[PDB]
Design a protein around this ligand. Sequence first.
Ligand SMILES: [Mg+2]
Ligand SMILES: [Zn+2]
Length: 333
Amino acid sequence: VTAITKVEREAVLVCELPSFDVTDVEFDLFRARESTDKPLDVAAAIAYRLLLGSGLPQKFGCSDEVLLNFILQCRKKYRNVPYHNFYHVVDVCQTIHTFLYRGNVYEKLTELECFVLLITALVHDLDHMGLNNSFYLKTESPLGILSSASGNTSVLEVHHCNLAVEILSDPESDVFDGLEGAERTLAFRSMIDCVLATDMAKHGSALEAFLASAADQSSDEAAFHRMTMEIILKAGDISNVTKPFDISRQWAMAVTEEFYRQGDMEKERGVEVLPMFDRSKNMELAKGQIGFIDFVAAPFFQKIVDACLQGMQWTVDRIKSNRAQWERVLETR
Ligand SMILES: [Mg+2]
Ligand SMILES: [Zn+2]
């Protein structure tokens, strides 16, 4: 890790985001990106403002400068891929901010846990190459073989955690340098547990563990806090369908192009291509979004809201409105 320069910091600090409210559930990152010729600087400035606006870094001895170094170190480890790039992780950070502060989920967590979640959003996909865990295992890729050999099939999530630890090992980019003892341990352990929990292979069991803890008045408190953090990073990570329809659609186009490039490489390597990754099946966006809504996103958001997350009701309302809009794309085709 080459240290961040003053010039790199200045390029972010000049961005004033005139007319954007980064705290708003209708905030539009696509419009923010189009708004200048320096979209990576605007994205960094959004993450910077969200973290300073929370008032959390200040409280844990993270200087403005170390915060901005950390953001730029994360940024340089994201790739030019259609979906799992720096814009996705800034989106998840912004979305988690809304869940915490507009959905009042902050009430369930300590300030340190709120700080860790906002920071975790920015590390949670470090050095993603636009290929899922399945690609690495099916192609017997070196990372795939290492995962199988070491007994953890969360190929990408372990890789993300490794690069997170690497950035935080330098004091100039350690947003947790203000912490010691049990607090520093909780910050690292909770960050890593959250990233590991974004593996969609663990979706069902992460959801069921959170619901069982939330229904249990005698749940271990530390365990309930940890599962709430995991569920909020998962929620941010599958939040695309909770956004205004046109933001939702732009996300779905970006993920479809990424899946298609994976399918192209799978064909090239002669491994199995799922229909959804197959550029030649040209399956409809509308049916794909409704399917993801019915089988994954609507049940997930409805169950966590009903369990205890009552303040996040708007996510369920928007999924319902987005599903009805996709139904109208079908009805009029
Ligand atoms: Mg991920
Ligand atoms: Zn992600």
